[PDB]
Amino acid sequence: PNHPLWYTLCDRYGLYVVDEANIETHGMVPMNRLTDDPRWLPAMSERVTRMVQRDRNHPSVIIWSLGNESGHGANHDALYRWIKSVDPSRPVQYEGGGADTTATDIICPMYARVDEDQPFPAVPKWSIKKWLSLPGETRPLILCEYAHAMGNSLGGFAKYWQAFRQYPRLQGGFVWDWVDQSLIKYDENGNPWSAYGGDFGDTPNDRQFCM
């Protein structure tokens, strides 16, 4: 969840918001180790329930998200249903565990490609065109993350947009991402320079991946 003013500005200027719970357990092995554990249900429930209680009156918020990169656990299903119960007015989405689990109303993959399948075990990233028509699949597809804009990037961006326009149920997505997470440091002359991971003696670090 963002600083409260953000929702007010999105209300007034006019932007659709996905409001997302402060839950990410990416570094767990496997990713759902905590989110499938009932002992972590209370801690997760608070991050979901208190977000809804704070932001449910904002018109800009049109979709609730259960968080990010935490695999798919039973705690997600419980909290998916909690939201659907207290607020039937907004769809719930969650990408973890393969982007099309029982805890999401929207197929919301990250970095799924337009035509090319990437069939990873357990959590394949199908071609988005192909994903829509998988046997039994009826849901809209909106990428929660796509077109990773790291450095000199966004090659093939037009290919997403041609597909979004041709396919009714391909309803777009959210570019990753808006702004570089670089920080300012000063050299010997007091001159500013843009710093990334590792430049603060922080170790281990992931270098320029914050940009």
Added chain:
Amino acid sequence: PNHPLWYTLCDRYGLYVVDEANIETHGMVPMNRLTDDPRWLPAMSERVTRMVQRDRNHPSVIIWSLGNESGHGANHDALYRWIKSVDPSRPVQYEGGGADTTATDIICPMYARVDEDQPFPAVPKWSIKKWLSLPGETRPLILCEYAHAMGNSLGGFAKYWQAFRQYPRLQGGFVWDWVDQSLIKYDENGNPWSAYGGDFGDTPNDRQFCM
């Protein structure tokens, strides 16, 4: 419906058969002028019911077809339901009136392209990849006719097969068609040559379109 021996041979050699009622009213304006008319229901019904009564015991027959290129009329809906009622063992297909009407268990377009939409009024031929995922659509797609093999043709045949393998619900199609309908004529020297439309004084004719 074919010569009765055809189905015996397909039973024994192993080919899947689509058995098709002898109903095509292509030249009517509009195409459904007779098939929507209850006065023509009796004549139409006999062509369907008597086909089913003859052929229902052949294992090679896996799909029933209501005919070809006769628009979509209320008589199709009646006869579709008649077949589902008497023979639950076989899906019923029919391409007329847009390839995805209430008279077909299978989206069965003719000459729908792989990636390119052809948005004709009333009866569009959507791209087959796109057709599958249209809002509310769940049926399998099998082209009743594709890859028109007229003369030097089958350009882009690979493109269909790439899509067929990639998309589970694209379950193939039927090439148009097996054999050139040329006829043998004899000149002055008594030497046989291959003849097409018009070569018999027949007029109007559609020339080499029979091949």
